[PDB]
Amino acid sequence: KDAWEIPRESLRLEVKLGFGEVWMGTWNGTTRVAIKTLEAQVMKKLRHEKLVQLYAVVSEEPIYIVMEYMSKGCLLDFLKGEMGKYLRLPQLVDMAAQIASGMAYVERMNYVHRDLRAANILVGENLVCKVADFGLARLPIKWTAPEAALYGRFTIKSDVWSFGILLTELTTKGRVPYPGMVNREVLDQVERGYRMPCPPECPESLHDLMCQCWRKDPEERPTFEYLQAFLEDYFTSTEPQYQPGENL
Numbered sequence: 001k002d003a004w005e006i007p008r009e010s011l012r013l014e015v016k017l018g019f020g021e022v023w024m025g026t027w028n029g030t031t032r033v034a035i036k037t038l039e040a041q042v043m044k045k046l047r048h049e050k051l052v053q054l055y056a057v058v059s060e061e062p063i064y065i066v067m068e069y070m071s072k073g074c075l076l077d078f079l080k081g082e083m084g085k086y087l088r089l090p091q092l093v094d095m096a097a098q099i100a101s102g103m104a105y106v107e108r109m110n111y112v113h114r115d116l117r118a119a120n121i122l123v124g125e126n127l128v129c130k131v132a133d134f135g136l137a138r139l140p141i142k143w144t145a146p147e148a149a150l151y152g153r154f155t156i157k158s159d160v161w162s163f164g165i166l167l168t169e170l171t172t173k174g175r176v177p178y179p180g181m182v183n184r185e186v187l188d189q190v191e192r193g194y195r196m197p198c199p200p201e202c203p204e205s206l207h208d209l210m211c212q213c214w215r216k217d218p219e220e221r222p223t224f225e226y227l228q229a230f231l232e233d234y235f236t237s238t239e240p241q242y243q244p245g246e247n248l
């Protein structure tokens with residue numbers, strides 16, 4: 001056992017929403033938390049503001065992982081839900097920048113997420129977004145870089161790829177990438193060089209970011225550190241004449 005380990009008595013489960021389940025709850029009475037009921041010492045060596053913070057772990061089984069509590073649920077739900085209607089390009093390019101920031105931190109540490117996509121970003125108060133679900137994590141395929149889906153070549157550079165697919169989620173309010181295409185149509189057509197076209201109302205400039213992120217060449221894709229800065233500066237350096245549209 002290590003120092004992350006706790007006893008269950010300190011854990012007060014409360015509300016189920018919603019591989020294994022996820023509850024809201026309480027830790028040592030004073031502390032509102034979240035529990036994932038189902039090894040993973042990566043959630044232990046990663047600590048950053050835009051990654052969902054581990055608090056404690058439990059095992060022997062039935063195993064409990066204890067995270068920081070994220071009030072608004074997952075980004076996928078949040079984008080398709082009531083909020084979606086009102087999210088506009090500056091909220092979204094910001095959420096992007098927060099995710100890039102967390103990923104830029106993952107980058108610095110020589111880690112790989114491997115399952116980066118909207119369903120794995122949790123949202124909080126004030127539109128805070130934080131990377132979560134290091135599921136698959138070391139040292140499905142519509143979001144997966146081709147070399148990864150094909151040859152198991154997972155790197156920070158295939159995460160950049162997913163990031164770009166996430167970018168399309170973000171700007172279509174949560175729609176499934178490659179609409180009307182099934183997995184084998186996507187794998188096949190991406191091998192031919194196909195890429196998602198500019199989303200409706202999305203600037204050409206941000207779709208280029210998307211295109212840079214989907215370069216066939218794992219190493220010609222950019223860094224998260226670059227993605228972060230370009231998304232932070234977006235409205236001054238890249239699109240300073242931005243004006244609201246009906247959707248974005």
Ligand SMILES: */C=C\C(=O)Nc1ccc2ncnc(Nc3cccc(Br)c3)c2c1
Nearest residue numbers: 034035036067073074076077119132133
């Ligand atoms: C987008 C679907 C999804 O994953 N759902 C989801 C909804 C709400 C929610 N609230 C709080 N926490 C989580 N997930 C979670 C992920 C990692 C660790 C922990 Br403790 C919780 C969700 C997930």
